[PDB]
Amino acid sequence: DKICLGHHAVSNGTKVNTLTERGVEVVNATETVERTNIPRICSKGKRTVDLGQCGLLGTITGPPQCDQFLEFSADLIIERREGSDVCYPGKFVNEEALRQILRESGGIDKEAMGFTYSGIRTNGATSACRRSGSSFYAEMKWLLSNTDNAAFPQMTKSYKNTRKSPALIVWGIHHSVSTAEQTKLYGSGNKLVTVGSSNYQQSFVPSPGARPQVNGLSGRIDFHWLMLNPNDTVTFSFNGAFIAPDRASFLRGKSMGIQSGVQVDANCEGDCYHSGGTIISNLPFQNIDSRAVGKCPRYVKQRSLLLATGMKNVPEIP
Amino acid sequence: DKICLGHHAVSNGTKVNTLTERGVEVVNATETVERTNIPRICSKGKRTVDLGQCGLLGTITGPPQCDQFLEFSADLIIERREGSDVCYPGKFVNEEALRQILRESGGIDKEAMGFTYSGIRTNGATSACRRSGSSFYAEMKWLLSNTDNAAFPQMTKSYKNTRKSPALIVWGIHHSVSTAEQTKLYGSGNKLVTVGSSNYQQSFVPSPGARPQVNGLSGRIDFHWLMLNPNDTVTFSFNGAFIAPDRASFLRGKSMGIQSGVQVDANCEGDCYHSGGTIISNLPFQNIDSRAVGKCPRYVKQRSLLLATGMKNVPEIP
Amino acid sequence: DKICLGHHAVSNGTKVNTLTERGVEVVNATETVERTNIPRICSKGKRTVDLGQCGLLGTITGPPQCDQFLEFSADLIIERREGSDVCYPGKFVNEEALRQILRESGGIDKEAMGFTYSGIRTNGATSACRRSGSSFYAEMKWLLSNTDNAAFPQMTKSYKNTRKSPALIVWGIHHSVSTAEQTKLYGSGNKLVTVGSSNYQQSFVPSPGARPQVNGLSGRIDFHWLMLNPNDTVTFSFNGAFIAPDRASFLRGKSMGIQSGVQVDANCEGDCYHSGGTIISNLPFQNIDSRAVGKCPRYVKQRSLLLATGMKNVPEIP
Amino acid sequence: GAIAGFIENGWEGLIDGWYGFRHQNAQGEGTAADYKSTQSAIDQITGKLNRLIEKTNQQFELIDNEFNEVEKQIGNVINWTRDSITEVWSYNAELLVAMENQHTIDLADSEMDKLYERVKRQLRENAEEDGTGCFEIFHKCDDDCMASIRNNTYDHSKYREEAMQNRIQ
Amino acid sequence: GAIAGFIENGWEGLIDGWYGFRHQNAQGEGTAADYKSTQSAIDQITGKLNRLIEKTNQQFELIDNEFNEVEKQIGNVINWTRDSITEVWSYNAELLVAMENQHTIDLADSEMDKLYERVKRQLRENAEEDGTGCFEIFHKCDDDCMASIRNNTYDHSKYREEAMQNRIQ
Amino acid sequence: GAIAGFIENGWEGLIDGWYGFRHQNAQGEGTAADYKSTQSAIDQITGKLNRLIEKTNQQFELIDNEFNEVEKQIGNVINWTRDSITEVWSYNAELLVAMENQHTIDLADSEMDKLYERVKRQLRENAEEDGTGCFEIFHKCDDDCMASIRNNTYDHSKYREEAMQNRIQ
Ligand SMILES: *[C@@H]1O[C@H](CO)[C@@H](O[C@@H]2O[C@H](CO)[C@@H](O[C@@H]3O[C@H](CO)[C@@H](O)[C@H](O)[C@@H]3O)[C@H](O)[C@H]2NC(C)=O)[C@H](O)[C@H]1NC(C)=O
Ligand SMILES: *[C@@H]1O[C@H](CO)[C@@H](O[C@@H]2O[C@H](CO)[C@@H](O[C@@H]3O[C@H](CO)[C@@H](O)[C@H](O)[C@@H]3O)[C@H](O)[C@H]2NC(C)=O)[C@H](O)[C@H]1NC(C)=O
Ligand SMILES: *[C@@H]1O[C@H](CO)[C@@H](O[C@@H]2O[C@H](CO)[C@@H](O[C@@H]3O[C@H](CO)[C@@H](O)[C@H](O)[C@@H]3O)[C@H](O)[C@H]2NC(C)=O)[C@H](O)[C@H]1NC(C)=O
Ligand SMILES: *[C@@H]1O[C@H](CO)[C@@H](O)[C@H](O)[C@H]1NC(C)=O
Ligand SMILES: *[C@@H]1O[C@H](CO)[C@@H](O)[C@H](O)[C@H]1NC(C)=O
Ligand SMILES: *[C@@H]1O[C@H](CO)[C@@H](O)[C@H](O)[C@H]1NC(C)=O
Ligand SMILES: *[C@@H]1O[C@H](CO)[C@@H](O)[C@H](O)[C@H]1NC(C)=O
Ligand SMILES: *[C@@H]1O[C@H](CO)[C@@H](O)[C@H](O)[C@H]1NC(C)=O
Ligand SMILES: *[C@@H]1O[C@H](CO)[C@@H](O)[C@H](O)[C@H]1NC(C)=O
C-alpha cells in the first residue's frame, strides 16, 4: 500500500524569467505590459471638443476657424494637426506655455474690455481672414490712421480685471512688408507700443521688412500675452502698428488637452490618451507611447514581461 | 512526558503589507514615513539671517529694508513673503537665477566701483525710498541731466574686477511715465545704454509710457545683472535713463536658502527644511513636503508604510 | 561507519552586504561598480575628428582655425577646451542648442547661397582673422558702404532651400566701438536688419559702444542662426552692420559629440565617453563620471558594491 | 505500474487542483486533490496580482508638442529627462517581475513541502519515505483509510501495532 | 490540559523571548525561552533597521519659488520632473517595505524550524513528533532532563534503552 | 579523530567542488565532491551574473557643457534632475546587490539541505542523524558501499536486516 504527494503540470508550459533562470517554464503566466491600443479617443463621461481646424491659441484671438470655440467649455480638449491659431500670418510669443495653460483651463469665458477710439479707423481687415468677405480676428481690432499716410495719434487705453480670477490678455504687433506700407497705414515716424501692468513691463517695436509670402501675404502679426491679476490693471500706450484686443479671457476651471489624429468615441470610457488613441488597462506597464498623458500605466522599453501565475511546470515521467 | 517548541504572540497585533498579503498581522512594526513636523526653523549651529521685509535681491541694490544686510554673512538664509527687492517700483531681469545664486553665497562682500561724474546730478531720489527723507537705492546712483530738460552728456565708465572671485554687477534702466518726463530728466533724443564685457554683450533702451501706479508711482526701474570674471572689465556707455551702481558684490562662500513663514529656533538643530518648518528624522521617507530642501528623507505619496519589526502574529488556541 | 555532508570554505573570505547583515563573509564575490578608466578616446571603427582649436560652431562660419572642417564628416566629434568659434570677437546667440545639434549631425555639407551685391564693398577684413594677411570668416561677408562715411543702400536678399533637409543659416550683427566707427563703415542713420522666414520672424539692431579689448579689438560680431525648412525661403532686408552668409549648412546624418582633454586611440574600441577618457565594461554601474555619454553603465555614488558569487563562508572547526 | 509523487515530475492528470494525493491499494489506484494547500497557493498568487493592479492617481499632462516642436534646448532637456525616467521604470519592471516570479515559484515549492511534511506527521511510525515523494504504508489501507489521511482523520494509534511488526520484520 | 507548540498558534504567555520551550512532566508544566534563536532573529531585524537609517549626504536646493511663481514653461517642466520622481520613490518605498516584510516574516519562520529541527536531532530515536510542534518523549524526563534539552546537554545514549522499549511496545 | 558535516563549519579541504561527501570506515577517511548539487548552484549564480551583464541600448548625449557653463536657471534644473536620478540608481544598485546577495546565500543553503535530505532518504532506516550533518551508518559500509551512496546506487534493502539489528540492540 502506498500514498504519494504531488502537484499538477501541463504540456502547455509558458516561459518566464527569474533572478537566476531565463526561460524557466511555469504552469500559467499573465502579461504585465500593455500593448493593446484602442485607436479612438474615448470620451464617454467627459465633455469633449474637437477643435479640428481651430488652433487652441486661436480660441482667444478668434480667426474664422475658431468662431465656434470663442467661449468653449470642456473636460477634454483635442488638438488636431490641421489646426491653426492664425488667419493673417504670424505666431504667438511664448506659444507653448500658453497652450499648456489653455489645455487645463476647462475652456474660456470672454469679457469685453471696453476700449473706445477717436480719430482713427478700427475696421482693419484682410483677405486672409475671409468671413463672408474680407475680415479680421474676431476678438481683435486692427487700428489704422484714418485716410492714408496720415498721422496716428498717440493713445493710452487701460483695463482693470474686476474679477476674482486672472485675466488672459492678448495684443498684437503688426509687421508691414515695407516702411512704405507701414507709413501708408499708421503714418511716418518710429512706432512704439508699451504695455504696463503691476508685475509686468515690456516694450514693443514693429519690424517692417520683406518676408516670404504666406497666404499671399508678406506681413506678420505676432501675438503677445500676459495674465492680469485680480484688481490689477493693464495700460496700452501706442501710436500705430498695434493690434488691440476687444475682449479678455478667463479660465473656466479644469481640463486635459491632448494631440491626436484619431476619431472620437462617446461610448468608450478612458483616462489615458496618446496621439494614436486610448489606453484602457489594469496592467501596471505599457509599451505604446512614452508621451501618453492622463492617468496611465508606466511606459517601459520592453514589449512583454510575463508574471508567473502558477507553479514551476515539471513534466511527468512517462 | 512532552516538550513543545513555540513562538510568542500578542492580542496587540499590527497589520502590515507583503508581496502576497495585505493587512497580515505581525507582533511589532515601526513607521518608515515621517509626518511629524517641527513648525520652526531649527538654526542651532548655523549662522542665520531672517531677511524679513528685505528681499534677497534687495541686499545687492539696497532699498531701506535691506540696509542691515548690505554685507551680510550667513550659513542659512531665510526669505519671507513680505520681503521686497524694491522700493521704487520695478523688477529684476533673470530674478530667479540670481536668487538661486545668492541663496548659496554665504552672504555678500561689497566693494566700491569708483565711478566719478561731471556735468550731471547724482542725487536722484524718490518718495518711495524714504530714508529719513526722500532717498534712493543705497548701492545705486540715479543720474540726471543737471537742471531740467537739459542735455545729458554721453558717458563711458569702466570697472575691473581685481579679485580672484567673480563680481556681481547690477545696473538699472529707468522707465519714465512719459517722454515728457524722460526729457525733463535726461533731455531729449533717443536714449541708449550699452554694457560691454569680454563674454557678455547687451543693449538697453528705455520704454517711457503710462503704467499703473505702484506706491503712487507709474515709473519703473528694471534691474539687470552679470557676473564679472577675474581681471575682466565692464564698460557702461550711456546718455541718460541709467541707474548706475556704486558698489559691486562678491560671494562670501557657501550657504543654503529657504522660504518660510514660521519662526526661528536657535536651540533646535536641523538639516531639512520647508516653508512650514523643519524635518528631523532617521526615517528614510517623509510625507510632509515634496519641495523640502537640505539633507532630507525622500518624499512619498503615502502617509504610512509600516515595516515589520517582529514575526507573524498567530493567536493562541484557547 | 559514518558519512557526512558538507560544503567548501576558505580563509580567503570576502565581505559583502545583504538585507540583514553588513559585512557577512562569502567564499567569492565580484565587483559591480566600474572604476577602471581608460584615459584615451577609443575611436576604432568610428570616423573621428579632433577639432582642436576649431570650435564646433566655428565650422559653420569658418574662422582660420576651422578651415579643415568646413565640410567635415564624422561619427564621433571631439571638442577641445582650446577650441574657439571665433576669430573676430563675438559669440553665438543660442549657442548651446546649436552645439547640441551639430554634435549629432554627422558633419556638415555646405552650399552656396548665391548672394550678389552692388554699390557696396564685401572685402571687409580684420587683423584678428589673419589668414596669410588680414582676412575674415570664410563663409561670411563683411559688407561696408563703399568709400568712408558713405550711405549704405537698403538691400533685400533671399534664399530658398531647394533640398529635402533643413538648412542651417547663419548671419551676424556687427557692433562697432562707437557711432563714429559705425558711421565710418556703414554711413549715418539708425541701422536695421530684419530676417524673415515662414515660421520665423525677428529683428536686429546694432549696439555701438565701448567694450573691453579682446584680441586688441573692442568690436563685437554676435551670430544668429535658424533652420530653414525645405522649399521655404529666408529674406535679409538690411542697410548696414550686417554680416552676410556666403554658404548654408546641411546636416550629413548621425553622430555623437564629446568634450575631452585626453588623446585619441584608433586601436581601442569604446562606446561610453567622458572628458577623462573611455569606459569599457560589462558592469551595470560606474563611479567615474555622472556626465558620461554614449551607451554607458548607470552612474552611482558608491565606489564599490560586491555581488556574492559564492556561498556564505563558514570556517572549519580546528 | 508504480506511482511516484513530487521530486522529479508533476502530474498532468491532476486537473481539479494544484496539489493532490495519489495512492494505490487493493482497490486500485486513485488521485485526489487537496483543497487547503491549493487554495493557500491561489490566494497568495492573486494577492500579488491585486497588488500590481493598484492604479496611480498621478495625472500627467503634455510637456512638449509633436505638431510644433518646442525650442531645441528645453526640448532636449525634456527628452533626456523622459528617457532617463523610462530607463528607470524599465529596470524596475524587469526587476519586479523577475523577483516576484522567483518568489511565486518558491512559495509553490514551499506549499508542496508543507503538505508532504503534514502527511509524514500523520502516519507517524507507520510508514517510510520512498524518496519519490511517496509513503510506503506498512499496513492495510483501504480506500476509506486513504480518505482518512486526505481529510486529516487518520489515527496512527489504530494501525501502529500492525505497521511496526511489518517494518521490523 | 494538553500543551501544543507552533503549527496553528503562538504563545501569549511567552513574554521573555521570541522562541521558547514548553514542557509537561510529573513536576508539572513549564515554559522557558531560547536565547540563541531569539537573539539571532532580533539581530537580523535590527540589521534591516540600521540599513534604512543610513542617511543621504545628497543636498538639494530650491529650484522654484512659492512666493513668486517662476515662468510657466520651465515651471511645468520642473513640476513634471518632480512628480515623475515622486512617483518613483513612492513605488520604491512601497516595494521595499513590502519586500522586507515578506522576508522578515519568512526568516522568523525559518528560525522556528531550525530550533525545532535541532531538538528533534537531540532526542534522536527517543521521541516522536505529535504534529503540533511537540515531541512525545518515551522516557521519564524530570525538570533536570528538560533543562538538559534546553541547553543542548541532553545525551540520548543515556535514555536510549528505556525509550525504544516503550516505543516498540 | 572524528568527522563533521555542515552545521557549524565548512571544509577548507573540499577544493574540487562546492558540496561534497566525507566518510570514515575501516579503510579510513575520504572526501569527495558532488557534481549535480555543485553544478546546480554554479548555474544559478552565473544566471544572476548574465542578468546584470545585459547592457542598455539607450544612448544619452550631452545636455550641458563643462567648458562654457550654460545659463544658471536651466543649468541648475539640469543638475537637480541629474542628482535626483543619481540618487535613484545608487539606491537601486544598493538594493539590488543587497537583495541578490541575500538570495545567493539562501539558495546555497537550500542546495546543502536538498543534498542532505536526499542522502537521508537513501539510507532509509539503516542510519541515524548525529546532528552535525553526518549519518551514523549501522552496518558495514566499505569504500564501495560509500561510493554507492554518492552515485545514488545504494539499495537499503541490502543492508536493512543488519542495520536494524544494530539499531535496536
Ligand atoms: C492563468 O492566469 C490568468 C491570469 O491570472 C488566469 O485568468 C484569470 O482568471 C480570473 C478568473 O477566471 C479572472 O478574474 C476576472 O476578474 C474580472 C475583473 O475583476 C471579472 O470581471 C471576471 O469575471 C473574472 O472574475 C482574471 O481576469 C483572469 N486574468 C486575465 C488576465 O484575464 C487564468 O485562470 C490562469 N489559468 C488557469 C488555468 O487558471
Ligand atoms: C517594536 O518595534 C520598535 C521599533 O524597532 C521597538 O522600539 C525600539 O526600541 C529600541 C530599544 O528599546 C530603540 O533603540 C533606541 O535607539 C536610540 C538611538 O540609537 C537610543 O538613544 C535609545 O536609547 C534606544 O537604544 C528604538 O529607537 C525603538 N524604536 C523606535 C522607533 O523608537 C520596540 O522595542 C518593539 N517592541 C518590542 C516589544 O520590542
Ligand atoms: C570568483 O568570482 C569570479 C566572478 O564570477 C570568477 O571569475 C570568473 O571566471 C569565469 C571563468 O573563469 C570568467 O568567465 C570568462 O568570461 C569571458 C567572457 O565571456 C571569457 O572570455 C573567459 O574566457 C571566461 O570564460 C569570468 O569573466 C570571471 N569573472 C571576472 C569578473 O573576470 C571566479 O572564478 C570566482 N572564483 C572561483 C574560485 O571560482
Ligand atoms: C483695488 O484697486 C484699488 C485701486 O485701483 C486699490 O485701492 C485697492 O486696494 C484694490 N483692492 C481692493 C480689494 O479693492
Ligand atoms: C589682466 O588684465 C590685463 C589687461 O587688463 C592682461 O594683460 C592680463 O593678461 C590679465 N591677467 C593677468 C593675470 O594679469
Ligand atoms: C515650393 O514653393 C513654391 C513657391 O515657392 C510653392 O508653390 C510650392 O507649393 C512649394 N512646394 C513644392 C513641393 O513645390
Ligand atoms: C524629443 O524626442 C522625440 C522622439 O523621437 C524627437 O522626435 C524630438 O526631436 C526630440 N526633441 C528635440 C527638441 O529634439
Ligand atoms: C508647480 O506645482 C505647484 C504645486 O501645486 C503648483 O502650485 C504650481 O502652479 C506649479 N507650477 C506651475 C508653473 O504651474
Ligand atoms: C552643475 O553641476 C556641476 C557639478 O559640480 C557644477 O560645477 C555646475 O556649476 C552646475 N551648474 C550650474 C549652472 O551651477
SS3 labels along chain C = CEEEEEEECCCCCEEEECCCCEEEEECCEEECEECCCECCEEECCCCEEECCCECCCHHHHCCHHHHHHCCCECCEEEECCCCECCCCCCCECCHHHHHHHHHCCCEEEEEECCCCCCCCCCECCEEEEEECEEECCCCEEECCCCCCCCCCCCEEEEEECCCCCCEEEEEEEEECCCHHHHHHHHCCCCCCEEEECCCCEEEECCCCCCCCCECCECCEEEEEEEEECCCCEEEEEECCCEEEECEEEEECCCCEEEECCCCEECCCECCEEECCEECCCCCCEECCCCCCEECCCEECCCCCCEEECCCECCCCCC
Cell of B37: 513636523
Task: Say if residue C181 carries a ligand binding annotation.
Answer: no
Q: Is the dihedral of CA A242, A248, A254, A256 positive or negative?
A: negative
Substitution site in E62, E79, E81, E86 for ligand 8 pocket (most atoms within 8 Å of beta carbon): E79
State the alpha helices, DSSP H only, in E20-71: 35-51
- CA distance linking residue D73 with residue B151, whole number of Å: 44
Are residues A191 and A131 located together in one domain of the fold? yes
- CA distance linking residue A150 with residue A161, whole number of Å: 34
CATH number of the domain enclosing B4: 2.10.77.10
CB B193 within 8 A of CB B241: yes
Residue C130 CB: number of other CB atoms within 10 A?
12
Rounded distance from Cα B248 to ligand 5 centre (Å): 20
Closest-CA residue of chain A to D148: A3
- CA distance linking residue B120 with residue B141, whole number of Å: 11
Rounded distance from Cα C230 to ligand 6 centre (Å): 9
CATH number of the domain enclosing B59: 3.90.209.20
- CA distance linking residue E147 with residue F1, whole number of Å: 30
- CA distance linking residue A232 with residue A244, whole number of Å: 19
Domain D1-169 has CATH 3.90.20.10: yes
**Sequence-ordered list of residues with C-beta below 8 angstroms from that of B249, at least 6 positions apart, any chain:** B60, B108, B109, B110, B111, B167, B168, B169, B170
DSSP, collapsed to helix, strand or coil, labels residue A106 as coil
- E84 and D125 within 8 Å at the Cβ level: the answer is no
User: The cell 545567493 sits on which residue?
Assistant: F104
CB A254 within 8 A of CB A111: no
Pairing of strands C285-286, C33-34: parallel
State the alpha helices, DSSP H only, in B48-163: 58-61, 95-103
Closest-CA residue of chain C to A215: C198
- CA distance linking residue A84 with residue A81, whole number of Å: 8
To test the contact with chain E by mutation, choose from A298, A299, A300 the residue with the greatest count of E C-beta atoms within 10 A, namely A298
Q: Is the dihedral of CA C79, C84, C85, C91 positive or negative?
A: positive
Angle between helices D72-123 and D35-51 (to 10 degrees): 170
* CB hemisphere CA count around B46 (13 angstroms): 24
Query: Which residues lie across from B226 on neighbouring strands?
Result: B169
| Ligand 9 near F121 CB (within 6 A) | no
What backbone torsions phi and psi does residue F131 show, to the nearest 5 degrees?
90, 0
Query: Which residues lie across from B298 on neighbouring strands?
Result: B285
- D73 and C101 within 8 Å at the Cβ level: the answer is no
Query: Which residues lie across from F128 on neighbouring strands?
Result: F136
Are residues C141 and C287 located together in one domain of the fold? no
Burial status of residue B73 (CB atoms within 10 A of its CB: 0-12, 13-18, 19 or more)? middle
Q: Which residues of D touch F121 (CB under 8 A)?
A: 129-131
Name the residue type at position F114. K
Pairing of strands B48-50, B272-274: unpaired
User: Which residue in E49, E21, E50 sits closest to E35, CA to CA?
Assistant: E21
- CA distance linking residue E123 with residue E138, whole number of Å: 10
Boundary-marking domain end, from C262, C285, C300? C262
Q: Subunits with at least 3 CB pairs below 8 A relative to chain F?
A: A, B, C, D, E
Specify the DSSP element, H or E, that contains B180. Answer: helix B179-186
- CA distance linking residue B95 with residue B85, whole number of Å: 10
Taking CA atoms, B84 is separated from B54, B81, B109, B274, C38, in Å, by 5, 8, 21, 20, 53
Residue A306 CB: number of other CB atoms within 10 A?
18
Residue A23 CB: number of other CB atoms within 10 A?
8
- Picking from B19, B22, B301, the nearest residue to D103 by CB comes out as B19
Largest CA distance in chain A: 118
- F58 and A22 within 8 Å at the Cβ level: the answer is no
Largest CA distance in chain D: 92
**Sequence-ordered list of residues with C-beta below 8 angstroms from that of F89, at least 6 positions apart, any chain:** C285, C298, C299, C300, D88
Cell of E58: 545628497
Residue located nearest, by CA, to atom 7 of ligand 3 = C30
- A94 and E73 within 8 Å at the Cβ level: the answer is yes
Q: Subunits with at least 3 CB pairs below 8 A relative to chain E?
A: A, B, C, D, F
- CA distance linking residue B153 with residue B175, whole number of Å: 19
Are residues A22 and A60 located together in one domain of the fold? no
- CA distance linking residue C194 with residue C187, whole number of Å: 18
Chain D residues with at least one Cβ partner in C under 8 Å: 71-73, 76, 87
User: The cell 489521511 sits on which residue?
Assistant: D149
- CA distance linking residue F135 with residue F128, whole number of Å: 6
Largest CA distance in chain F: 92
The range of the structural domain enclosing residue B220 comes to 47-262
Chain A closest-CA separation from residue E106 CA (Å)? 19
**Sequence-ordered list of residues with C-beta below 8 angstroms from that of E16, at least 6 positions apart, any chain:** E33
Largest CA distance in chain E: 92
Chain F closest-CA separation from residue E12 CA (Å)? 31
- Per DSSP, E90 falls in state H
CB F86 within 8 A of CB D84: no
- CA distance linking residue F151 with residue B96, whole number of Å: 77
CB A5 within 8 A of CB D133: yes
DSSP string, chain D: -----SSS--BTT--S-SEEEEEEETTEEEEEE-HHHHHHHHHHHHHHHHHTT------B---S-SSS---HHHHHHHHHHHHHHHHHHHHHHHHHHHHHHHHHHHHHHHHHHHHHHHHHHHHTTSEEE-SSSEEEESS---HHHHHHHHTT---HHHHHHHHHHHHH-
Q: How many residues does chain E have?
A: 169
Chain F closest-CA separation from residue B102 CA (Å)? 12
Taking CA atoms, C192 is separated from A208, A239, C118, C199, D163, in Å, by 10, 20, 19, 20, 112
Pocket of ligand 8 (CB under 6 A): E 69, 72, 75-76, 79
Boundary-marking domain end, from B222, B238, B262? B262
**Sequence-ordered list of residues with C-beta below 8 angstroms from that of C121, at least 6 positions apart, any chain:** C143, C144, C145, C146
- CA distance linking residue C204 with residue C207, whole number of Å: 10
Pocket of ligand 1 (CB under 6 A): A 28, 30, 309; D 49
Are residues C25 and C144 located together in one domain of the fold? no
- D129 and F121 within 8 Å at the Cβ level: the answer is yes
What backbone torsions phi and psi does residue E115 show, to the nearest 5 degrees?
-70, -45
**What does the angle CA A164 – CA A170 – CA A173 come to, to the nearest 5 degrees?**
160
CB C279 within 8 A of CB C288: yes
CB A78 within 8 A of CB A260: yes
Largest CA distance in chain B: 118
Name the residue type at position A74. A
What backbone torsions phi and psi does residue C73 show, to the nearest 5 degrees?
-135, 140
Residue located nearest, by CA, to atom 7 of ligand 8 = E66
Rounded distance from Cα B232 to ligand 5 centre (Å): 8
Q: Which residues of E touch B52 (CB under 8 A)?
A: none
- C209 and B197 within 8 Å at the Cβ level: the answer is no
Residue E69 CB: number of other CB atoms within 10 A?
10
CB B279 within 8 A of CB B296: yes
Expressed in Å, this structure's resolution amounts to 2.9
Are residues A192 and A67 located together in one domain of the fold? yes
Are residues C70 and C203 located together in one domain of the fold? yes
Task: Say if residue C110 carries a ligand binding annotation.
Answer: yes
Specify the DSSP element, H or E, that contains A273. Answer: strand A272-274
Name the residue type at position E20. G
Q: How many residues does chain A have?
A: 318
Chain C closest-CA separation from residue E34 CA (Å)? 21
User: Which residue in A2, A221, A21 sits closest to A125, CA to CA?
Assistant: A221
Q: Say whether residue B237 is in contact with chain C using an 8 A CB cutoff.
A: yes
Q: How far apart are the first and last CA of chain A?
A: 22
Cell of A311: 507553479
- Domain tally for chain B? 2
Taking CA atoms, B241 is separated from A62, B175, F24, in Å, by 39, 7, 104
Query: Which residues lie across from D152 on neighbouring strands?
Result: none
- CA distance linking residue A78 with residue A54, whole number of Å: 10
Query: How many helices and strands, by DSSP H and E, does chain B display?
Result: 3, 28
Annotated binding site of A for Ca(2+), which residues? 71, 109-110
* CB hemisphere CA count around D52 (13 angstroms): 26
Are residues C22 and C121 located together in one domain of the fold? no
Name the residue type at position C55. G
Experimental method: X-ray
Chain B closest-CA separation from residue A4 CA (Å)? 28
- B237 and C210 within 8 Å at the Cβ level: the answer is yes
Sheet containing strand F28-33, edge to edge, reads F28-33, F19-25, C2-7, F134-137, F127-129
CB B204 within 8 A of CB B224: yes
**Sequence-ordered list of residues with C-beta below 8 angstroms from that of E83, at least 6 positions apart, any chain:** D58, D60
Boundary-marking domain end, from B246, B262, B278? B262
What backbone torsions phi and psi does residue B76 show, to the nearest 5 degrees?
-125, 120
Dihedral angle of Cα A174, A180, A181, A187, to the nearest 10 degrees: 70
Pairing of strands C108-112, C76-79: unpaired
Instruction: Scan residues 72-131 of B and list those with Cβ closer than 8 Å to F.
Output: 94, 96-97, 100-101
Cell of D74: 528645453
User: Which residue in E20, F100, C201 sits closest to A172, CA to CA?
Assistant: C201
DSSP, collapsed to helix, strand or coil, labels residue E155 as coil
- CA distance linking residue B226 with residue B167, whole number of Å: 8
Number of the ligand 2 atom closest to the C-alpha atom of E49: 5
- CA distance linking residue E149 with residue A202, whole number of Å: 90
Residue located nearest, by CA, to atom 3 of ligand 9 = F79
Cell of A23: 526561460
- CA distance linking residue D104 with residue A311, whole number of Å: 7
- CA distance linking residue F32 with residue A271, whole number of Å: 64
User: Which residue in A8, F88, C211 sits closest to B157, CA to CA?
Assistant: C211
Annotated binding site of A, which residues? 71, 109-110
User: Which residue in A34, A35, A29, A33 sits closest to A17, CA to CA?
Assistant: A29
User: The cell 532699498 sits on which residue?
Assistant: B63
Specify the DSSP element, H or E, that contains F160. Answer: helix F156-168
